[PDB]
Write a protein that binds this DNA or RNA. Structure first.
Ligand code: CA
Ligand code: CA
Ligand code: CA
Ligand code: NA
Length: 285
DNA sequence: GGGGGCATGCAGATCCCACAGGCGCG
DNA sequence: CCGCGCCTGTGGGATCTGCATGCCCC
């Protein structure tokens, strides 16, 4: 097939679903492997097939019977990833993992990792990447095992980025309690609270719910007023369209919202049509 | 000729998704 | 009374992330 993704839409999807990896396994020879991975359900397998088509790089492998992932692992292959994220930077705290990813690329590019000092520099880089060093790798190289990293406070660059972030970690659904209510919600780890609260001002609507800050690792940005949803959330994603099955979930979302606008959610066939839309909305296509 | 990186995966940990009920308020 | 929407709460899987190596080339 043939497809191409907007560069800013892709960065937003990377901020939500991407992952930068640096594995150092024993072979004192060491297996060092840089990677960038986006693993998704098979329902969204065409995104990864399309992102591979945009970057013209990467491999697609099966992960189980229901999941698929795009993994970029070759050295020359990783050059296109950095060139994309140098001009379209990541916004969430994952950008720090990319920064350490870029440093690791340069060390391997200069062939420094083939010596003892080069491996020591990368295990120090890996210490700050994602979940840090494992217990076995922390047995050696206890010099700089500090897993903490400078936090990343950044603002939303554009709505094209938001479409890719929403396509990842967002959700469009409809509640029936009978009464009809459309709800838009984005969840995220508490580490990007300042970025999540940016959406209140960036969108002019929505609320932030956290619960007990202790013993809960993630907050929620949610908008429930229909006026804010029909006027300030749906047009902004019609101009900057989403990707993956989230688009079709969003498509049927506005189809239901059009019925609520015409006040047609009182007829028996209106809710019967609304219920049929929901029956294949998120559990289905 | 062999050391390092490619090929192509498999396995673990958790951050999400897609909701739920209660209820004060206009 | 009706119905909207703030507010608190969540199971579990789709994510994020980690682990693995025989074999290829140069
Ligand atoms: Ca995410
Ligand atoms: Ca997702
Ligand atoms: Ca996600
Ligand atoms: Na959705």
């Amino acid at each position: 097939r043939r497809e191409s993704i907007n560069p800013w839409i892709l960065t937003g999807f990377a901020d939500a679903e991407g992952s930068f990896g640096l594995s150092i396994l024993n072979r004192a020879r060491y297996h060092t492997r840089l990677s960038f991975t986006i693993m998704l359900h098979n329902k969204d397998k065409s995104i990864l097939e399309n992102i591979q088509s945009t970057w013209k790089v990467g491999s697609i492998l099966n992960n189980g019977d229901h999941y698929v992932s795009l993994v970029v692992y070759r050295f020359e292959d990783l050059k296109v990833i950095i060139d994309h994220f140098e001009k379209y930077p990541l916004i969430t705290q994952k950008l720090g993992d990319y920064k350490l990813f870029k440093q690791a690329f340069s060390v391997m590019e200069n062939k420094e990792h083939l010596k003892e000092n080069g491996i020591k520099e990368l295990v120090r880089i890996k210490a700050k990447m994602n979940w840090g060093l494992n217990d076995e790798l922390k047995k050696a190289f206890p010099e700089n095992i500090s897993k903490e990293r400078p936090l990343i406070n950044k603002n939303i660059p554009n709505f094209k980025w938001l479409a890719g972030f929403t396509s990842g970690d967002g959700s469009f659904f409809v509640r029936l309690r009978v009464r009809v209510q459309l709800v838009f919600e984005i969840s995220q780890h508490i580490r990007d609270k300042n970025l999540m609260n940016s959406l209140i001002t960036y969108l002019g609507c929505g609320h932030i719910y956290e619960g007990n800050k202790s013993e809960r690792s993630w907050l929620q940005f949610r908008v429930e007023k229909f006026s804010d949803i029909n006027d300030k959330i749906i047009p902004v994603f019609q101009e900057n369209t989403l990707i993956g099955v989230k688009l079709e979930d969003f498509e049927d979302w506005c189809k239901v919202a059009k019925l609520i606008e015409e006040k047609k959610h009182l007829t028996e066939s209106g809710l019967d049509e609304i219920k049929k839309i929901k029956l294949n909305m998120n559990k289905g296509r």
